[PDB]
Amino acid sequence: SRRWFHPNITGVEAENLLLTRGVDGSFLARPSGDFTLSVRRNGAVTHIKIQNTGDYYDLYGGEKFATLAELVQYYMEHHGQLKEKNGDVIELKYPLNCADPTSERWFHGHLSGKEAEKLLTEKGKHGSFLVRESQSHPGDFVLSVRTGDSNDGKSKVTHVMIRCQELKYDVGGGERFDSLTDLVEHYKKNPMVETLGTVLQLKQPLNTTRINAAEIESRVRELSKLQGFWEEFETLQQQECKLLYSRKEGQRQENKNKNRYKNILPFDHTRVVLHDGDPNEPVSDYINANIIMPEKSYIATQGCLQNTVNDFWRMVFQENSRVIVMTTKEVERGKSKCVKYWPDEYALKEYGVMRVRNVKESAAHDYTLRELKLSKVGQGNTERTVWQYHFRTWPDHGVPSDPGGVLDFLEEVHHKQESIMDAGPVVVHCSAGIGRTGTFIVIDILIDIIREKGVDCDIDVPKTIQMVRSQRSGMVQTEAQYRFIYMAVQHYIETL
């Protein structure tokens, strides 16, 4: 559901909300890459700070998580794991639900009848809908739907007054809902039937984020007004509760030590399964990594630990990957982000059954290139060249101020990968493998669409991210990475 996130309440409104409308164990989360988890306990309201600079959600006194939903799901089940300074347990028990419609994909606020009609007729299909502020009746709202099978009369647009009376919503009779969302959800599952038989099915929200890449710069300007980026990004975040897929294998005891961050885990249904492991290891099939198929494929993975370097090379070898993309230093802010899993220049190392040679390095302004030779010990004819592209200039926090270095780096990576016939997925990793990694992967996906079809194509940044987030938890972590994605695709379009 994710109703426990309130996008625009002050901390004072949060406290009054838990004290008057909550009970002990009630909780919510709120913004202002800073977030707060506000929890009621012994008739008092504690606030816990959550930080995200780009890599993961860091909860004070708790753990690191891929998404707020996964964070809230974890503590609602594990329990005893959220303590304070004293050391008494803070139990998250009851979501305090938000009523705002600001982060719903279908809520368009200020918007006239004919405006909605022009949008629903140029971008909608049968079942497309939206909700908007009633102009004629200040305070009320309007559900606009399209139904039908052009100008063949086979389609139509229907409006439906939503009255708002004493903070509750209704459509003229029947039940009175505590929120526009509860009303939409109800009439999505129990569609409204017109007199003459037409069924007003709320099938999908009118899409507003798909743009023609040629008009990219116009949308970045429209989104930079008052900020629109934040509105669009937090609406995507609202959809993260649909991606709580199982991550059981990463939770097994044998696999625990193979995870850089305890709770940042690969989805079972897209994880990379490693075969050909020796029988003496009870579980030899596990690495913290997921296949990302756009819909060139990718593998998104964490930075190596000393005890997974061998597994990382079994993955590279098994998947036939020929390009690796590193977007972290080994160490940053004094903290290990990825052990050196490659040999020094000219040297030759064995990593278990795998043997790697660093043939030559090449330094560029923003990145170093390492030409590596990977083979299985025992059969020399298995040798293949793996090209490691090590971006080194990514800031410790946030994103770069100009996308130019990243784009130039990514163009190189693309050309090398395109030059090797039958190359496997491109391996992309940072520290946790979801923020910088997701950002790089989504930029590459978008730009590939544009390199093949030119500037005269459609691209949809939030929908692409959602597709990628359904294959690895929390891909693209922050609003600043989001804005960077837009700004990088704007910059790439204008170099053409």
Ligand SMILES: CC1(N)CCN(c2cnc3c(-c4cccc(Cl)c4F)n[nH]c3n2)CC1
């Ligand atoms: C004013 C608003 N409340 C209404 C419309 N609008 C949108 C609309 N659609 C999306 C999306 C999205 C697109 C595709 C798939 C998924 Cl899963 C998404 F989540 N992300 N962000 C969005 N913002 C701006 C805010």
